[PDB]
Structure formats: structure tokens, C-alpha cells
A paper describes a structure:
The four Phosphatase and actin regulator (Phactr) proteins are novel PIPs that are implicated in cytoskeletal regulation in animal models and cell culture settings. Here, we show that Phactr1 confers sequence-specificity on the Phactr1/PP1 holoenzyme.
We also assessed the substrate specificity of a fusion protein in which the Phactr1 residues 526–580 were fused via a short SG linker to PP1 residue 304, solved at 1.78 Å resolution. The PP1-Phactr1 fusion protein behaved similarly to the Phactr1/PP1 complex, indicating that RVxF interactions are not essential for specificity.
Author numbering: 6 to 298, 310 to 364
The structure:
């Protein structure tokens, strides 16, 4: 792997017009996937990290906002980074986004961490853009190589034994951290249960305990669920993403939970800022945010609106895709022996 060549080419588009592509070869991206996958498997599924550290929420393929985020926070290894998932889909340059992130994971495996979001799974990113991007610029085989890599991402991270991090949120099935640790990879993300909730659930001040999630997936959880969780496991903060928030960061449950969203002007459909959170050695939290026109800075002004081909799917098309997902997951997608029960199949 010519990693430094790969990275330099991904960064060279800094200062170009947002949208311009980085031309990696099929084997270079195949290399990124296979080596990063090996590193993800060598590391815990429940990461145990230490401050200082910067944490980012969703990026969703907004590659040039990711460059601007690093320009603002520091390019690795100038800062340590944890990303909370959702690197692909919805944006137009998921491939450059994930490839840079995976390259930095190979370049700095001890100072750069990527958690699994609900969009790093085959059933979701098949629909919401990524699969289309791989087919267009490369081939279906490469989308399946990414799927193998995504199936090996860690699911959560604890920073200094006090900040619990995941993409979505808590689970009613999450009683012991050991339940996360015992999950075997490669694995799919199930249609319900602990691994589903960890990547899909949301907080809600209106809920006392657990409530209905408007997505039709997983649940919502209330502030008391947050407080009881923190007290039981002697934590101080939950850090998660998954939800657009006005200023890129938003506190919840007496500032015991924070939502981070790093994609400003998300999909060109919200007036939101993107935020990174800095955690220093003394566990102090602070924020830097990219706003469209606590430290502030102006976000890049380009057209983030993207085509939403899933809205055009016919019932016949949906059926065909479910058949494709089922065949792929049944005959090709590698799944650890102890995790086949988690493989999310679809109704015929
Ligand atoms: Mn999400
Ligand atoms: Mn998201």
C-alpha cells in the first residue's frame, strides 16, 4: 500500500472546487479497505480511549466539509480524532470521505478512530447513495469490499472511563458493557436489539423512560435513562451523533448527553452548523463549529443538495433490492459464525 501517496492525493484537492474527485485506483481502495479492516479487527469493538481528543459526528460524504473540519481542528496527527459514524450516504463524495478516514486509520491507528454508524451497513447504504457511488465510479465488487470493512468497525468507545460514545444511543438491552464486547465481527447490524439500538436510538426530553422512535427503528430514551445509565456505570457523559442539531452540538439531560453533528448545511436541507468537540486531558469539553452565513467559523458555501433516488423506488424495485440484499448477505457477505443471527435479512 502506497499510503502516503494515497493521502497526499486525497488532501491535494484542498482549495479546489468542492465536488472534484480524487482518482484512487480500485486496488488502492481495495487496499485501504483490507488493511483498515485488519486494524479494526485487531482493536476492541468497545474502544477505550484517553483524552486529549477531538470528536466529530456525522459527515455523510461531505468531503470538503471534512477537509475544512481538519483545517479548523488540525490535520492528524496534530489532533487525535474519534468519529461517531455515518461517513457515507446522502452526500456526493462518500468514497473520498471514507477513503481518507480509512487512510488516516491506517496511518495513525492509535490516534484516529472511527465508530460504526447506522449508515455503515449494507441494507442502509445500499439505498441511500453509497452503493450508487461505488457502482458509478467503480463496481459492485468494491461496494462489497467496503461492506466487509464496515462490518468490522467498532461500535462504541469509552474515553477516560467517563464518556461513553456511540452513533445513536442507549438500548433497553444494554445492561453490561460486556454485552458490547462479546459481539463478534464481522457482523451485520440487526433490525432490532442491542446493536440496532446502539446505532439507531435517540434521546427525547418528552420521554420519561423509553418511547417510540419516529424512524420506525429502535427506540427513544429519556433523561432519567441517561442519568441512571451514567450512575450505574460511573460515567459522566454520553457523546453521540445521528441527529442534526442547530449549532452542531446540543446538550441533553442536564448536560449529561451531548449530540454532535459535523456536517454543516446537511444535505443542503438544514441551516445547521457542523461541530467538533474537544476533550482535553482534564476531561474539559469545548466546541468549534462551522456555521453557514465555543469558537465559530464560516462553513464553505457550496451546493450540498443531493439526489435522493430512494424516493423514486417502485414497489417492484424495492422487492428486487431486497432479493439482492438477501442473496448477497446469504452467499457472499462474510459474517462471524457467532453473529449470523444478527444478519438483517429482508422480507421477500
Ligand atoms: Mn445516523
Ligand atoms: Mn446520520
Amino acid at each position: 500500500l502506497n499510503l502516503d501517496s494515497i493521502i497526499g492525493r486525497l488532501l491535494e484537492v484542498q482549495g479546489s472546487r468542492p465536488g472534484k474527485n480524487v482518482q484512487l485506483t480500485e486496488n488502492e481502495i481495495r487496499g485501504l479497505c483490507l488493511k483498515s479492516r485488519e486494524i479494526f479487527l485487531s482493536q476492541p469493538i468497545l474502544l477505550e480511549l484517553e483524552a486529549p481528543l477531538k470528536i466529530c459526528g456525522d459527515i455523510h460524504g461531505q468531503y470538503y466539509d471534512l477537509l475544512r473540519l481538519f483545517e479548523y481542528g488540525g490535520f492528524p496527527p496534530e489532533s487525535n480524532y474519534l468519529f461517531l459514524g455515518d461517513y457515507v450516504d446522502r452526500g456526493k463524495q462518500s468514497l473520498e470521505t471514507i477513503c481518507l478516514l480509512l487512510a488516516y486509520k491506517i496511518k495513525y491507528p492509535e490516534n484516529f478512530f472511527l465508530l460504526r454508524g447506522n449508515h455503515e451497513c449494507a441494507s442502509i447504504n445500499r439505498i441511500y447513495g453509497f452503493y450508487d457511488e461505488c457502482k458509478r465510479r467503480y463496481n459492485i465488487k468494491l461496494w462489497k469490499t467496503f461492506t466487509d470493512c464496515f462490518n468490522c468497525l467498532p461500535i462504541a468507545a469509552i474515553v477516560d472511563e467517563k464518556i461513553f460514545c456511540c452513533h445513536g444511543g442507549l438500548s433497553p438491552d444494554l445492561q453490561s458493557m460486556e454485552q458490547i464486547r462479546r459481539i463478534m465481527r464481522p457482523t451485520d447490524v440487526p433490525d432490532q436489539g442491542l446493536l440496532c439500538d446502539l446505532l439507531w436510538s435517540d434521546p427525547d426530553k418528552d420521554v420519561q423512560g423509553w418511547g417510540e422512535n419516529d424512524r420506525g427503528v429502535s427506540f427513544t430514551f429519556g433523561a432519567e435513562v441517561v442519568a441512571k445509565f451514567l450512575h450505574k456505570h460511573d460515567l459522566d457523559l454520553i457523546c453521540r451523533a445521528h441527529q442534526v442539531v442547530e449549532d452542531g452540538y446540543e446538550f441533553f439531560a442536564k448536560r449529561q448527553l451531548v449530540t454532535l453533528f459535523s456536517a454543516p448545511n446537511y444535505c443542503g436541507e438544514f441551516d445547521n452548523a457542523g461541530a467538533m468537540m474537544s476533550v482535553d486531558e482534564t476531561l474539559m469539553c469545548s466546541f468549534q463549529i462551522l456555521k453557514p452565513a465555543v469558537e465559530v467559523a464560516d462553513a464553505q458555501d457550496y451546493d450540498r443538495r443531493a439526489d435522493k433516488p430512494w424516493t423514486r423506488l417502485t414497489a417492484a424495485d424495492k422487492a428486487a433490492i431486497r432479493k439482492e440484499l438477501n442473496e448477497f448477505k446469504s452467499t457472499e457477505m462474510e459474517v462471524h459464525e457467532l453473529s449470523r443471527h444478527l444478519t438483517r435479512f429482508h422480507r421477500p
